[PDB]
């Protein structure tokens, strides 16, 4: 009556051009949820004003229970097929959002009502409901599937498109209501293939894609027939349908059936993919960022995966094309040839080596093409071959690459920087010690990058500096180098405040760097230490407040803690022994004890890592806490969290070494679970190896305690360490097993063939270890006699039989 007369003035002040009414109507707006629906459903005036009443209504939690959620729902379902198409769709959003506020049950009629409106004579009533039922499916209704299937046939383009759109949201659910009707869907999809409407066509494509992953059995009878269709849809006008069709090849290539099925089509397929791997619309949005997923990337991804499926067999289908692309023609056609060259790379590597001595120099040339987008993928494609470049004499490929790439890191645009700096990290990683001749040279540029780069690329730079430190190790420990790398890092450190998330990459970098610099990091180590402890202390303190009162205290970003703990762990690994003083005066160990308890696996993972690190550096100070830690270590021997388990396991191993016989009381609370982890099927090889060594280290220091269980682990123990090369750690574990064997020889009898193989895996064991092995193997030959021993070792493979003979005289 009076408020509706001011609502004509409310949607005209939201239509008046003035900036004074653009602020005043924004203040008058959020100050209602019943009046609007009357303006849209009933209330004469201009048509934009009737629908702008809908936008502010759909914008509007308190009205969902305030009796109006039965009065508004009255007006919309009654007028779901309005005159203007605008009003009809605005209702569609409104029916969605009213039901979308949770799984609200003020609407028992909803589903059964719209599924009755579908068989209406009035088109806009049928279309209205179907557009509403689709919006629901994308955000119990399975019985509609056979009815949905019926609308595939007769109606407009629109209705058919909703029909296929709805049935699509049930393929993943694998619902009975559709799975019984399999062939009706498939056959109806085929009849909807020829459809001269793109919106329909992509849904048909999308359906056939999900069908690849949910009902492979039904498509196989056709397959070679569906491929011919998908190949045409991949090539379609309208890039939407093309893209959805593309996902096919990516999905298909993930099913074992792919290998033998596609072989015939390859000559037809590949050219089509490669053709889609270039750009045009997106091209101008890059000179004058594009999407996270388009046809180009999908085609590329497909081509990468196929290369991994067919390996070298892919080459004859592609090399021809690659030559026409790499050299011949200009910008875009060329660019795509080099992307193809990188895409192919992982899968068909070996088959392309012959071609590298000619191509990598050619790529090194493109690194300075006058077109940025040619520069960028050149960086990338080159990094896909870093391993070959580094395996050749440094002067021919490495030296010029490292030269040009370094230029590319600087200047150009942000996109070539990114590619080049990330590519250079890949080089560093593969080159390792081969870059020592250039440390000063490299560091010169990366320090300039540090001034030039913006936040996004800065992150990638940090990684390149980190990777450098890791790949070169101690060779970074020279005053020339530390003198240039350290100032820019301290600058950022000082510039950042403890609450700044930009502190994460910096400290993770400074962690890799601190290890590389052994004692060089001493001038810097005090404040770095102190700040980390502060971070951990503050993070836990805030978490305590939140635990006490979530209402009043913001929970912390525990990443400040994960990052501080990883830097303390890199400081400990670097200074080892020199850290002693700092540790003593700080309260890290108390804090670490809270961290080991933290509910976030990452925080536990980081502290156990630090625990083992500090056990090596200054066990003097870790010892008093051993009684407290070991129960928690015991608790965290749980494979559900692989990383935490590994680090706990690692720390135990490290602990035992530091306390000889003294470790005995602590073995029971740890041993059982270690034996369970090693016998566990489908377990990461890193966790198994570490578990293998810890068992070894424990039994070495306390044979009487662990030997009893030698039968339960000897086999998996052997099967694990059996395959890693010779090292100071495998040696330390093998000692422990030897000592345990000469305490419970019985425990080995059953699986003794595995111990023989585990011994034969050694190539240059230390003399003391060589003897333990020798004395054991002989002890067993003597035990059973020569005749029985002859019978037993006759069941060995040749290389085992021969090496045990030669090496151990047995």
């Amino acid at each position: 009556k009076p408020d509706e007369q001011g609502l004509q003035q409310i949607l005209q002040l939201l239509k008046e051009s003035q900036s004074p009414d653009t602020t005043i109507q924004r203040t008058v707006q959020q100050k209602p949820d019943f009046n609007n629906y009357l303006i849209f459903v009933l209330t004469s005036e201009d048509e934009p004003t009737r629908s702008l009443s809908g936008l502010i209504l759909k914008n509007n939690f308190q009205n969902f229970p305030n009796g109006v959620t039965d009065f508004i729902k009255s007006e919309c379902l009654n007028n779901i097929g309005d005159s203007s198409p605008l009003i009809r769709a605005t209702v569609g959003i409104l029916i969605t959002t009213i039901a979308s506020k949770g799984e609200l049950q003020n609407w028992p009629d909803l589903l059964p009502k719209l599924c009755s409106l579908l068989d209406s004579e009035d088109y806009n009533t049928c279309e209205g409901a179907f557009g509403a039922l689709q919006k629901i499916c994308e955000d119990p209704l399975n019985i509609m599937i056979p009815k949905f299937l019926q609308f595939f046939k007769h109606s407009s383009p629109k209705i058919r498109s909703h029909a296929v759109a709805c049935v699509n949201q049930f393929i993943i659910s694998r619902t009975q209501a559709l799975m019984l009707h399999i062939d009706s869907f498939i056959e109806n999809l085929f009849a909807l293939a020829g459809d001269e409407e793109p919106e329909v066509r992509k849904n048909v494509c999308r359906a056939l894609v999900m069908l690849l992953e949910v009902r492979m059995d039904r498509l196989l009878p056709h397959m070679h027939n569906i491929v011919e269709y998908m190949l045409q849809r991949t090539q379609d006008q309208d890039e939407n349908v093309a893209l959805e069709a593309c996902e096919f090849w990516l999905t298909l290539a993930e099913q074992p059936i792919c290998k033998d099925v596609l072989v015939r089509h390859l000559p037809k397929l590949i050219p089509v993919l490669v053709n889609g791997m270039k750009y045009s619309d997106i091209d101008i949005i890059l000179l004058k960022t594009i999407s996270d997923w388009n046809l180009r990337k999908c085609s590329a991804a497909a081509l990468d995966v196929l290369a991994n499926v067919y390996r070298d067999e892919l080459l004859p289908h592609i090399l021809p094309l690659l030559k026409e692309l790499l050299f011949h023609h200009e910008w875009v056609v060329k660019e795509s040839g080099i992307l193809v060259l990188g895409a192919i790379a992982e899968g068909c590597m070996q088959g392309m080596i012959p071609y590298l001595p000619e191509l990598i120099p050619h790529l090194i040339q493109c690194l300075s093409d006058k077109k940025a987008l040619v520069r960028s993928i050149t960086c990338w494609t080159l990094s896909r071959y870093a391993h070959w470049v580094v395996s050749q004499p440094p002067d021919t490929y490495l030296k010029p690459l490292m030269t040009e790439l370094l230029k590319r890191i600087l200047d150009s645009n942000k996109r070539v920087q990114e590619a080049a700096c990330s590519a250079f990290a890949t080089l560093e990683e593969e080159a390792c010690t081969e870059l020592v001749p250039y440390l000063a040279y490299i560091l010169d540029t990366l320090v300039f990058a540090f001034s030039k780069y913006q936040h996004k690329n800065l992150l990638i730079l940090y990684d390149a500096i980190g990777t450098l430190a890791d790949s070169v190790g101690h060779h970074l420990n020279k005053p020339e180098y530390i003198q240039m790398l350290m100032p820019p890092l301290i600058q950022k450190w000082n510039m950042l405040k403890d609450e700044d998330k930009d502190l994460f990459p910096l400290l993770e970098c400074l962690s890799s760097v601190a290890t590389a610099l052994q004692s060089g990091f001493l001038p810097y180590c005090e404040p770095v230490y102190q700040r980390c402890v502060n971070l951990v202390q503050k993070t836990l303190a805030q978490a305590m407040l939140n635990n006490a009162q979530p209402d009043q205290y913001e929970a912390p970003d525990k990443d400040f803690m994960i990052v501080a703990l990883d830097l303390l762990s890199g400081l400990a690994e670097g200074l080892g022994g020199n850290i002693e003083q700092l540790v003593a005066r700080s309260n890290i160990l108390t804090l670490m004890y809270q961290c080991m308890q933290d509910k976030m696996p990452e925080v536990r993972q980081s502290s156990f890592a630090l625990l083992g690190d500090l056990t090596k550096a200054c066990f003097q100070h870790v010892k008093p806490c051993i009684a407290d830690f070991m129960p928690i270590l015991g608790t965290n021997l749980n494979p559900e969290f692989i990383s935490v388990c590994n680090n706990a396991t690692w720390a135990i191993g490290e602990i035992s070494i530091q306390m000889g016989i003294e470790m005995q009381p602590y073995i029971p609370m740890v041993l059982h679970q270690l034996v369970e982890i090693i016998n566990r099927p489908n377990t990461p090889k890193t966790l198994l190896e570490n578990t293998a060594i810890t068992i070894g280290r424990l039994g070495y220091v306390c044979p009487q305690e662990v030997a009893p269980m030698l039968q339960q682990f000897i086999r998996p123990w052997c099967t694990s360490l059996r395959n890693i090369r010779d090292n100071e750690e495998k040696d330390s574990a093998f000692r422990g097993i030897c000592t345990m064997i000469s305490v419970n020889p019985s425990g080995v009898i059953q699986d003794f063939i595995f111990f023989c193989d585990a011994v034969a895996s050694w190539i240059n064991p230390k003399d003391d270890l060589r003897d333990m092995f020798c004395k054991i193997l002989h002890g067993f030959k003597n035990q059973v006699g020569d005749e029985n021993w002859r019978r037993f070792s006759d069941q060995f493979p040749l290389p085992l039989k021969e090496r045990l003979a030669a090496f151990y005289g047995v």
Binding site: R296, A301, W380, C421, E508, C509, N690, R722, N723
Partner: peptide, 27 residues
């Protein structure tokens, strides 16, 4: 047995990812 798939050791802690990262790539 007898022939040993030769491998570098993974002994030691599993250090967490750095908070920088490399280039996601063209695709």
């Amino acid at each position: 047995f007898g022939n040993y798939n030769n491998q570098s050791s993974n002994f030691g802690p599993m250090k967490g990812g750095n908070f920088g990262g490399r280039s996601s790539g063209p695709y």
